[PDB]
Structure 1
């Protein structure tokens, strides 16, 4: 029963996505999303990169398929 379905790959945000701060004052550091607060705001924790523990938005940040 070969029933070919396309691939439709994504980048879905489980606790353990390392992200990339595109604008702000981290400006290219590596956080880790920890407590998803709402659909647009997202918590971060990357404390040895020099970041705070804040709840940034989603338009302010990009991410990567690398995931712990």
Structure 2
């Protein structure tokens, strides 16, 4: 066959889930320009934003009509359960682990070191025989 390698880009389209401020989720509801979109979400304010200020996530909210108001976006977001889909990805998991690490205390860091010593002992023991 032809065997053409295609790009795996993320598209600016109605229904794209985006991160805003590296904390909160929102979805694209309508495209303004090459540079600007209108975003909305359950926990964010409906606003016109520049695509440079947001990051497209690999998640699409399916069947979201163009220009949907806040109620429609919230209802379809709850139905598609976008929050759970986001929280199950390695991206959100790495963000959560970064936050959890940033909340450790000095005593907890000491415990982390001690447990790491124990796990390294076990790992070297397993590695030498395999």
Identify whether the pair has TM-score above 0.5, normalized to the shorter chain: yes
Give yes or no for contact 2:13–2:30 (8 Å, CA) kept in 1: no
Q: CA RMSD in A?
A: 1.2
Whichever structure has more helix as a proportion of its residues is: 2
Match of 1:8 in 2: 7
Match of 1:53 in 2: 46
Structure 1 runs of 4+ with >3 Å offset:
none
Which of 36, 47, 55 is equivalent to 2:31?
36
Which residues of structure 1 form unaligned runs of 5+? none
Larger radius of gyration between Structure 1 and Structure 2: 2
The two structures have a TM-score, normalised by structure 1, of: 0.79
Query: Relative contact order: is structure 1 or structure 2 higher (C-alpha 8 Å, sep ≥ 6)?
Result: 1
* Paired positions, count: 61
The two structures have a TM-score, normalised by structure 2, of: 0.44
Which residues of structure 2 form unaligned runs of 5+? 62-130
